[PDB]
Amino acid sequence: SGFRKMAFPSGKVEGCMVQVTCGTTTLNGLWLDDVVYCPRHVICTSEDMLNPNYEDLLIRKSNHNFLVQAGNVQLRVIGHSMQNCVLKLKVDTANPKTPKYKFVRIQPGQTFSVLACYNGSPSGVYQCAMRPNFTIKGSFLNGSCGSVGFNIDYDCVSFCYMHHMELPTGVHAGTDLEGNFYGPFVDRQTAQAAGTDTTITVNVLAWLYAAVINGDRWFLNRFTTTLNDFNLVAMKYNYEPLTQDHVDILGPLSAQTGIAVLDMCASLKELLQNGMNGRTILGSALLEDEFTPFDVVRQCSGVTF
Amino acid sequence: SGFRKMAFPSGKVEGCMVQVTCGTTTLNGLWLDDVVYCPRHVICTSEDMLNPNYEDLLIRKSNHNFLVQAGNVQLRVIGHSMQNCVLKLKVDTANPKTPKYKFVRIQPGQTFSVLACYNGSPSGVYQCAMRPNFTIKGSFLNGSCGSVGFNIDYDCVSFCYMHHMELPTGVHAGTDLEGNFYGPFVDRQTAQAAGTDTTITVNVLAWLYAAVINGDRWFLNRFTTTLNDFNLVAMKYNYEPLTQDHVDILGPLSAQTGIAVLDMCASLKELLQNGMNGRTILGSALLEDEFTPFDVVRQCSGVTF
Numbered sequence A, B: 001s002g003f004r005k006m007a008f009p010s011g012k013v014e015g016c017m018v019q020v021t022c023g024t025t026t027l028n029g030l031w032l033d034d035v036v037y038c039p040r041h042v043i044c045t046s047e048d049m050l051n052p053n054y055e056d057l058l059i060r061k062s063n064h065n066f067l068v069q070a071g072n073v074q075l076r077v078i079g080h081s082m083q084n085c086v087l088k089l090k091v092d093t094a095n096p097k098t099p100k101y102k103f104v105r106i107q108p109g110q111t112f113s114v115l116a117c118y119n120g121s122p123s124g125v126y127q128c129a130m131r132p133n134f135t136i137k138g139s140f141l142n143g144s145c146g147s148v149g150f151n152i153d154y155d156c157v158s159f160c161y162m163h164h165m166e167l168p169t170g171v172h173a174g175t176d177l178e179g180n181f182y183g184p185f186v187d188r189q190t191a192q193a194a195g196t197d198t199t200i201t202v203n204v205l206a207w208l209y210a211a212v213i214n215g216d217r218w219f220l221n222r223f224t225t226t227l228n229d230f231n232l233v234a235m236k237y238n239y240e241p242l243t244q245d246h247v248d249i250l251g252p253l254s255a256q257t258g259i260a261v262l263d264m265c266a267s268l269k270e271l272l273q274n275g276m277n278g279r280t281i282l283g284s285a286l287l288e289d290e291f292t293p294f295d296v297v298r299q300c301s302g303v304t305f
């Protein structure tokens, strides 16, 4: 039936993306109700970034310096405040398309859809995971700051990410919609690097279950294992420790496939130790860790919105 | 800056997806203006499929057997015709959300976005390619038939695919929005199989250019090559022949990176002959052929909608 990395439908979010310009910098904003949220470093010049005192820099800001544009319409700014690392630009016009929404701070290992935009016009949509080191592997060019990541939980858009930064290592850092960075990152042009990027073990197992459900089963072994034993091989290969909570989460997948979680851990142990010998699982020559158990069950059932 | 497999924003298409039920079967339809397009095998029972005479089967169809549903609203059927392998269900209500659109029949090797739906509610969005053997590798569960693939060309939604079939080999077959299957496939429950799936050579090179643009450059060699010579190694590995037109298409990528196309072909030759030796390009251990030169330039510039 198939298994692919897919994003949520982005309709509800498209009509929330505006353009924000401050001086010579232009990036994306998120317009919900009468507020436009964007990264506060829109007010810095390439030189301010080396050591910004955002509060002082913000004193020098008139609403007139903030030119917000919804496609072609231009919006009115009747105030501007700062919440952590995001600017809250109050406007008079409530977005007639504001969806039911929450702001959620997601956990490392969880996934969201990113709607990439350039100058307030959506460009594409793709799925990301919040790595254990609080980075994401996305596609953000110049003009992409302000793009948001989100999940559609039932009838509600849960905003969880706004793009701010590219690390000189080529990965991406950002904040929740309250302006708190994920990870130890600061919006200053200084030496910062991502910590060791470990692999999300619970997700790899959900992917191996997704593979079993889709006929790929050459990795299923007769061996079995215990949590403690498996977590030794995991630590060796910079894999995340597998807790009992993680096994409980894989319950429904174990039930559907008829393969105890610890039996799947036995298969993963051998793949880490011996490799794929040139076979592929669901089309990859590598172990995939950016599907949650919930991404899998969702795709192997048929949940809609 | 990043390179990811991303779909077009699906907002314009979401509000075009309805639910169609005929008897015991329910699948998705596409409602543009006053017409609902869906796969004609919605009228067959699991038994009719072994040898359907769709024209006769359609005689026995009253509009009353066709229950169309837009989310919760129910639509009126004032006629029903058949164009090749798609039913055109005329309704009285024009979709107030019909976007500017064309119906395009895409070429093998080109990509489109699929909006997967289950019972007329969109589930997710992902990018596919039309393989050289006129199949696609997607994610279509029960209830997914009728989901469409599309490209957003400027201001126009170009519909190019509607899902009909899963081959017993696990790949997917479907039609253009005029009801003509891609490939030699028929909507009958009989022995049919996909031909040899060759690799889209022009796309792999666009991906290797995308990789160079993103700092991955360990594959760039001093060797060079000619078209004829390279196409010998390609044929060997079930790769598509590279024409001069394909080299002209890679022009803009060659220009941006400063690497003649034939020099990139020299790199691909060595990767096919020797393998990756455990390195990765843009995060894959395998050569990716589902990005067109246009998908790449689009992501390495910043084209929006």
Ligand SMILES: *C(=N)N(Cc1cccc(Cl)c1F)N(C)C(=O)[C@H](Cc1ccccc1)NC(=O)OCc1ccccc1
Binding pocket: A027, A041, A049, A140, A141, A142, A143, A144, A145, A146, A164, A165, A166, A167, A168, A186, A187, A188, A189, A190, A191, A192, B001
């Ligand atoms: C957002 N509009 N955007 C522009 C952008 C996009 C892709 C790559 C780069 Cl290099 C780029 F500038 N971003 C990511 C930025 O404007 C940020 C702003 C910033 C700068 C410094 C610290 C925090 C935020 N630019 C950025 O991340 O540049 C890379 C960088 C990061 C840290 C230290 C030096 C350089």
Ligand SMILES: *C(=N)N(Cc1cccc(Cl)c1F)N(C)C(=O)[C@H](Cc1ccccc1)NC(=O)OCc1ccccc1
Binding pocket: A001, B027, B041, B049, B140, B141, B142, B143, B144, B145, B146, B164, B165, B166, B167, B168, B186, B187, B188, B189, B190, B191, B192
């Ligand atoms: C669409 N609603 N859908 C249901 C569906 C989804 C995933 C897997 C399967 Cl097996 C499945 F049935 N499809 C793909 C179908 O309804 C088609 C209808 C059909 C049947 C036979 C020939 C053409 C079209 N089912 C299908 O492709 O089943 C697989 C198959 C194909 C060919 C021969 C035998 C079986």
